Amino acid sequence: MYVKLISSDGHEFIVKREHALTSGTIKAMLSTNEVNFREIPSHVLSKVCMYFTYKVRYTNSSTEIPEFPIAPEIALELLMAANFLDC
Amino acid sequence: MDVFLMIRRHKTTIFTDAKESSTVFELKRIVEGILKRPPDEQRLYKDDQLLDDGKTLGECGFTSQTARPQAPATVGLAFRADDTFEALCIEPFSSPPELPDVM
Amino acid sequence: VLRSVNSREPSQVIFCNRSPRVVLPVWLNFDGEPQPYPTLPPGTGRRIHSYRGHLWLFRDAGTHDGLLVNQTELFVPSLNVPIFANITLPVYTLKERCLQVVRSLVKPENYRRLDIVRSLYEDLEDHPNVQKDLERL
Numbered sequence: 181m182y183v184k185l186i187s188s189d190g191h192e193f194i195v196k197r198e199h200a201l202t203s204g205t206i207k208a209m210l211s212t213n214e215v216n217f218r219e220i221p222s223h224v225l226s227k228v229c230m231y232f233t234y235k236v237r238y239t240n241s242s243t244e245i246p247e248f249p250i251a252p253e254i255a256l257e258l259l260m261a262a263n264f265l266d267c
Numbered sequence: 268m269d270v271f272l273m274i275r276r277h278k279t280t281i282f283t284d285a286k287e288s289s290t291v292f293e294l295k296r297i298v299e300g301i302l303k304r305p306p307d308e309q310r311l312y313k314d315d316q317l318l319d320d321g322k323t324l325g326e327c328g329f330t331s332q333t334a335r336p337q338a339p340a341t342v343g344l345a346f347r348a349d350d351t352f353e354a355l356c357i358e359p360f361s362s363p364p365e366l367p368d369v370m
Numbered sequence: 371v372l373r374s375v376n377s378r379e380p381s382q383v384i385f386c387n388r389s390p391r392v393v394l395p396v397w398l399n400f401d402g403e404p405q406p407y408p409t410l411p412p413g414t415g416r417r418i419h420s421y422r423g424h425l426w427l428f429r430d431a432g433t434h435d436g437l438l439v440n441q442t443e444l445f446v447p448s449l450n451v452p453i454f455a456n457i458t459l460p461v462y463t464l465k466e467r468c469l470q471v472v473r474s475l476v477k478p479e480n481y482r483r484l485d486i487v488r489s490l491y492e493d494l495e496d497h498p499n500v501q502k503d504l505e506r507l
């Protein structure tokens with residue numbers, strides 16, 4: 181049902197299992213209901229979780245899709261995480 | 268309409284959605300399924316305001332257009348250890364580093 | 371291969387920019403060469419005289435990020451029973467979206483001055499372009 185994603189600084193993010201398996205990397209780390217990310221801090225991993233929600237909500241919707249916001253101060257680390265998770 | 272939430276306590280953050288018409292108590296039932304603590308051991312907050320079990324999320328100001336998938340609204344959560352409720356504490360996420368000179 | 375058909379049958383169309391980007395409409399001419407048309411501000415529309423079987427795609431005018439039109443990549447005017455061309459943001463991958471934000475902040479000369487794995491250098495430099503997108507036949 182839910183899985184726990186733990187950031188490098190110890191924040192625990194609990195997201196729906198279906199949303200987490202969007203990432204092929206997470207699917208492999210799970211297959212446990214818990215994944216530790218030694219390299220991804222909480223200000224990045226929280227944004228990753230909001231991307232999951234946004235993606236699931238707006239994929240295959242013929243309404244108007246809003247832009248996914250990314251503050252400049254986190255963009256570089258978010259890019260690294262997205263590159264690693266293939267997100 | 269769906270509202271998208273982060274339910275936060277200490278260093279725990281639950282990402283979930285709920286209906287604007289669903290109640291605060293029904294959200295505690297969601298928290299219960301996840302963190303295994305019954306509703307009577309939970310207090311839910313909007314900022315510093317304690318939320319009443321019978322109110323709907325919409326009445327408490329969680330609306331589909333503010334509690335968005337890409338920018339969810341925060342619900343604070345506090346547990347009763349046995350007697351008395353802990354104070355509401357939410358640990359902030361980490362701080363981003365300084366913007367590199369090229370930016 | 372990706373070529374407008376010279377039907378000479380008029381087809382009236384409305385470009386409707388339902389995105390937050392300034393939109394560059396691109397007509398693929400009879401030789402397959404992309405032809406740019408006047409840009410559309412966000413949330414604005416325009417009535418266009420086109421032809422059945424012609425081929426159009428749509429891009430962010432500043433960055434050439436790909437956009438969707440009626441939920442696909444190409445728009446082909448059909449028989450007027452005007453045709454609505456709803457231009458929208460795709461759901462970008464998180465990676466592509468981050469590349470978009472980083473490109474908007476860092477000068478292309480300075481991509482190599484960023485502390486990231488080298489494969490991300492090439493991703494940043496491999497910016498979107500209709501010319502690459504047209505190849506996939």
Ligand SMILES: COC(=O)c1cc2occc2[nH]1
Pocket residue numbers: 219220221224257258260261264
């Ligand atoms: C602050 O560090 C990060 O955001 C980060 C995550 C990750 O994964 C592979 C490399 C890498 N860097």
